[PDB]
Structure 1
Amino acid sequence: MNLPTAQEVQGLMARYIELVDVGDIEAIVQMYADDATVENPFGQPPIHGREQIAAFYRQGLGGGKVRACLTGPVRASHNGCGAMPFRVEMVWNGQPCALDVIDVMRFDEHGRIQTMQAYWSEVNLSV
């Protein structure tokens, strides 16, 4: 595909959440451009390229324990970009916890994620 339309951005970013929820690291790495830049959380030093991205996601999702689901519709632009609200559920201190996040993504002319910024901090972590 080329630069995703607004409707295609909605589908791609929803698909990314489904892949995070099932914990398929390889499928996520494939969604990213080979030289993608990721800032998670935004304000922290970026990581770059599929090698660093694969390591980051496997550290986060390798155990398959995390769950993720959209908490609102994906907002999409006409220049291949979008932003989405979601909630992440995992284990912290034994008790279950929930983290509210917004990801901003820009896609390239091949339909792959070129950049991603994940906005969240401890003020978004419940229980």
Structure 2
Amino acid sequence: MNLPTAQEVQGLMARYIELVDVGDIEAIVQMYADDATVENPFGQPPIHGREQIAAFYRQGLGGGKVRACLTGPVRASHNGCGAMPFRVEMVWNGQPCALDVINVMRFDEHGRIQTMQAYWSEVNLSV
């Protein structure tokens, strides 16, 4: 495919959340461009490339029990970008906890994620 239309961005960004929710690390990594970046949380230096990105998702999702769900609709653009609000259910010290996040993505001219930026800080975590 080419640069995703607004409707295609919606679909891709919702699919990303589905894949996080089901914990399919390999399928998530395949959504990214080979040389993509992830800034998590936004404010921290980017990681680069599918090896580093795979390591990020393995560290976050490797336990197999994380859940994630949109908390409202994707807001897409006409230039291959979008933003979405969601909540992640994780564990911490055996305590269930939830993290509220907004991801901002930009897709490349092949429909792959070029950049991901995850906005959140510590007060978005609730034990």
TM range (shorter): over 0.9
Q: CA deviation at 1:74?
A: 0.2
- For structure 1, the residue ranges without an aligned partner over 5 or more in a row are none
Q: Secondary structure at the match of 2:93?
A: coil
Aligned to 2:66: 66
In 1, the alpha carbon distance for the partners of 2:19 and 2:46 equals 21
In 1, the alpha carbon distance for the partners of 2:82 and 2:51 equals 24
Q: CA deviation at 1:109?
A: 0.4
- For structure 2, the residue ranges without an aligned partner over 5 or more in a row are none
Tell me whether 58-67 or 76-85 shows the greater mean CA deviation: 58-67
Q: Secondary structure at the match of 2:56?
A: helix
In 1, the alpha carbon distance for the partners of 2:95 and 2:19 equals 24
What is the alpha-carbon root mean square deviation over aligned residues? 0.6
Q: CA deviation at 1:58?
A: 0.4
Q: Secondary structure at the match of 2:65?
A: coil
Deviations 1:36-59 (A, max 9, x none): 011000111110000000011001
Q: CA deviation at 1:95?
A: 2.0
Q: CA deviation at 1:30?
A: 0.5
Runs of 4+ in 1 over 3 A off after TM superposition: none
Tell me whether 90-99 or 28-37 shows the greater mean CA deviation: 90-99
In 2, the alpha carbon distance for the partners of 1:10 and 1:67 equals 20
Q: Secondary structure at the match of 2:57?
A: helix
Tell me whether 49-58 or 92-101 shows the greater mean CA deviation: 92-101
Q: CA deviation at 1:70?
A: 0.3
In 2, the alpha carbon distance for the partners of 1:22 and 1:64 equals 8
Deviations 1:66-90 (A, max 9, x none): 1000000000000000000000001
In 1, the alpha carbon distance for the partners of 2:118 and 2:95 equals 24
Q: CA deviation at 1:63?
A: 1.2
Q: CA deviation at 1:92?
A: 1.4
In 2, the alpha carbon distance for the partners of 1:88 and 1:69 equals 7
Percent of residue pairs bearing the same amino acid type: 99
Q: CA deviation at 1:93?
A: 2.6
Per the normalisation by structure 1, the TM-score is 0.98
Deviations 1:13-51 (A, max 9, x none): 000000001111110110000000110001111100000
Alignment coverage as a number of residue pairs: 127
